[PDB]
Swiss-Prot record:
Record's subcellular location: Cytoplasm, Sarcoplasm
Organism: Physeter macrocephalus
InterPro entries: Globin, Globin-like_sf, Myoglobin
Modified residue annotations for Phosphoserine: 4
Main location: cytoplasm
Name listed for the protein in its UniProt record: Myoglobin
BP GO terms, sorted: removal of superoxide radicals
Annotated binding of nitrite, by residue: 65
Residue(s) carrying Phosphothreonine: 68
Subunit comment: Monomeric.
Single GO MF annotation: peroxidase activity
Keyword Iron: yes
Length: 154
């Protein structure tokens, strides 16, 4: 699958808004993930003690991680599909160390879409949401292929 340049521009135009405050967006996204699919929190030995949204919001460490996650994803999106170099270490760690199934990457993709839809109606209309879905699908497709190369079913 291949996104058009027009599609990449819709992706990067909403990402430009995320970048006004990546820390805020990362908190929203991880909290949405953990609330919508509580099982995902159990993968984080670092964070699985957090009991409530209030505790999550107050966690400086969770905020730090959200910035790390969105910055890595931002770097991937800015490659506009040319993300082989970026996907190698991410696939290896997430397959082998963290053991994150592809379904959980689907869950975080859903969280990203939900947060952008909520925060950014001006840059996340139907066409833009479709482009972001396509970008995130491409990301998961390529990650899943790497998972298989690495010996993880996903
Ligand atoms: C958009 C998809 C994701 C991106 C871009 C991303 C990015 C990252 C990055 C950059 C790191 C630090 C370096 C590394 O270990 O590779 C990391 C760590 C980690 N990721 Fe992800 N991640 C994603 C999805 C997920 C999901 C869905 C889960 C769990 C359901 C997860 C679980 C973890 C865990 C447990 C760590 C180690 C946290 C720690 O103890 O420091 N990741 N991730
Ligand atoms: C998706 C949901 C889950 O718990 N696993 C392990 C999946 O593959």
């Amino acid at each position: 699958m291949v996104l058009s340049e027009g599609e990449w521009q819709l992706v990067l135009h909403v990402w430009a808004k995320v970048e006004a405050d990546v820390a805020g967006h990362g908190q929203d996204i991880l909290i949405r993930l953990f609330k919508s699919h509580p099982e995902t929190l159990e993968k984080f030995d670092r964070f699985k003690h957090l009991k409530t949204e209030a505790e999550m919001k107050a966690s400086e460490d969770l905020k730090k991680h959200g910035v790390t996650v969105l910055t890595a994803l931002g770097a991937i999106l800015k490659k506009k599909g040319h993300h082989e170099a970026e996907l190698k270490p991410l696939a290896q760690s997430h397959a082998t160390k963290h053991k994150i199934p592809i379904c959980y990457l689907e869950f975080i993709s859903e969280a990203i879409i939900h947060v952008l839809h909520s925060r950014h109606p001006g840059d996340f209309g139907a066409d833009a949401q479709g482009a972001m879905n396509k970008a995130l699908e491409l990301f998961r497709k390529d990650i899943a292929a790497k998972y298989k190369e690495l010996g993880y079913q996903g």
